[PDB]
Design a protein around this ligand. Sequence first.
Ligand SMILES: *[C@@H]1O[C@H](CO)[C@@H](O[C@@H]2O[C@H](CO)[C@@H](O)[C@H](O)[C@H]2NC(C)=O)[C@H](O)[C@H]1NC(C)=O
Ligand SMILES: *[C@@H]1O[C@H](CO)[C@@H](O[C@@H]2O[C@H](CO)[C@@H](O)[C@H](O)[C@H]2NC(C)=O)[C@H](O)[C@H]1NC(C)=O
Ligand code: CU
Ligand code: CU
Ligand code: CU
Ligand code: CU
Length: 497
Amino acid sequence: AQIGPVTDLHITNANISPDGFSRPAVLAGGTFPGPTIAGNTGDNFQITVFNDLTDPSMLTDTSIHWHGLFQKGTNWADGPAFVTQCPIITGQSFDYNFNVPGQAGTFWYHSHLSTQYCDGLRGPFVVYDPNDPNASLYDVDDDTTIITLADWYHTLAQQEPIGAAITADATLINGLGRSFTNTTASPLSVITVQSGKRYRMRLVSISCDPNYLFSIDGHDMTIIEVDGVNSQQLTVDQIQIFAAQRYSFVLNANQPVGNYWIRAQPNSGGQGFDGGINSAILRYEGATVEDPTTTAPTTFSNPLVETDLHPLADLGVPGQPFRGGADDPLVLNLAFANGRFSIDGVSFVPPTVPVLLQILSGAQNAQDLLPAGSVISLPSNSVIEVALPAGAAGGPHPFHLHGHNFAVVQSANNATPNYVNPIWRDTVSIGGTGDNVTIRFTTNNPGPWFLHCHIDWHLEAGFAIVFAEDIPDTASANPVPQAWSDLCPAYDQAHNI
Ligand SMILES: *[C@@H]1O[C@H](CO)[C@@H](O[C@@H]2O[C@H](CO)[C@@H](O)[C@H](O)[C@H]2NC(C)=O)[C@H](O)[C@H]1NC(C)=O
Ligand SMILES: *[C@@H]1O[C@H](CO)[C@@H](O[C@@H]2O[C@H](CO)[C@@H](O)[C@H](O)[C@H]2NC(C)=O)[C@H](O)[C@H]1NC(C)=O
Ligand SMILES: [Cu+2]
Ligand SMILES: [Cu+2]
Ligand SMILES: [Cu+2]
Ligand SMILES: [Cu+2]
């Protein structure tokens, strides 16, 4: 069952063994992944999060972010710890009460305190459209068509030793998969289809780090949505999906009744499919209950290339059709050294007072805001351009902007900008050395919006900045409930701050 749009959500510790190895975890709704939160476009979500965490090895505080939802007028509900709230302490609850006007598509929810989402607090979040312009392209779209891709670690997130390399121990597809080392034949996930029907598969990366090469033996995939944005139909046989991205694709169950490998190849950790790692099973009704015997091609025929995507709607691009053709053109210097990332020479360290609270308390320029140099003001009602040139170690880095989606004016591995019809999305690979991935948006959403690499280990190591969008209007635009005002006093009392 899907839950929502008005629902309780309990956060707990428990042991799980998704790849056969037992470890404690941080769970929403008692499961990994968490339950799908869903509603319809424009609905009021009220998600009352109960923090019932008792195991300090994975932190007993928490904060949840509703990834890709714009939160206009509810910046207080966005989730990122010390940007928009103080964390919820154990034994307390908090009602994330917000609305989703003008959005429909595939999203997700995750802890946004430290690297706690790696420990398990990650789930899908779907906003259906009763008048979906893509409705007629498929027959089935429900909880059974959601496909999550997750990295899973046997070492707890807080206990990753500083100075050693971090790689995962299993790829989990719909919460199951097999360990890269000491592989056991634990259960694989099964996605069931009926011969002749068409399915809106909602492909969600809930990854803390690796990108996946996703494919389904014998099948192709027709992409119709990119991070919440309806796309023209694009048929591909493989999708490279970066951390926090979503695609919907039409799967036509048009192959012979049988079993077909679903493949998700991470860019780090175990390479290949030996022992059934990196795999799930696509099973047609009436097939024998047995593993697929299919194989991948040596080379895929039609891999997704981001420049091939275009919006279904005539979304265009704001500003002028050249570099710097914006009201506020920015170029970020994105760097890594000595274990820390930095943006324009500053490494993000979360402040003691959340940025939003600072602004509501009367700090009214970005140079008054802490951390110093990590908060950049944006002017209201203006076209913003942000070039994100790559080269920092640990790439390719998927950059994500809260409160907004954006036109991808230039994509990875292609020096040509597109000022006519590029895809809009909310998380984008900035590519490789020499690249100049560039985004554009307009500022019609007052508040502090986080911008950061979505590799959670990089965010923890400082690869972030806060855009304080329309500081003058932030208080008037984002009235705050008493419960929100109560968070920082309660958090600060519980931690003796
Ligand atoms: C990425 O594109 C940006 C513009 O969006 C480039 O910014 C220019 O940088 C040069 C210095 O290299 C300055 O003289 C200009 O003021 C910048 N803005 C312009 C021309 O609009 C940036 O160099 C590009 N970076 C890479 C690595 O290609
Ligand atoms: C590199 O990116 C550019 C810009 O997004 C792509 O160029 C466009 O190509 C399409 C399809 O051929 C044409 O309809 C557009 O007119 C082009 N726009 C521009 C601004 O050139 C290009 O195809 C990409 N390269 C590859 C190899 O995919
Ligand atoms: Cu996210
Ligand atoms: Cu987000
Ligand atoms: Cu990164
Ligand atoms: Cu974030």
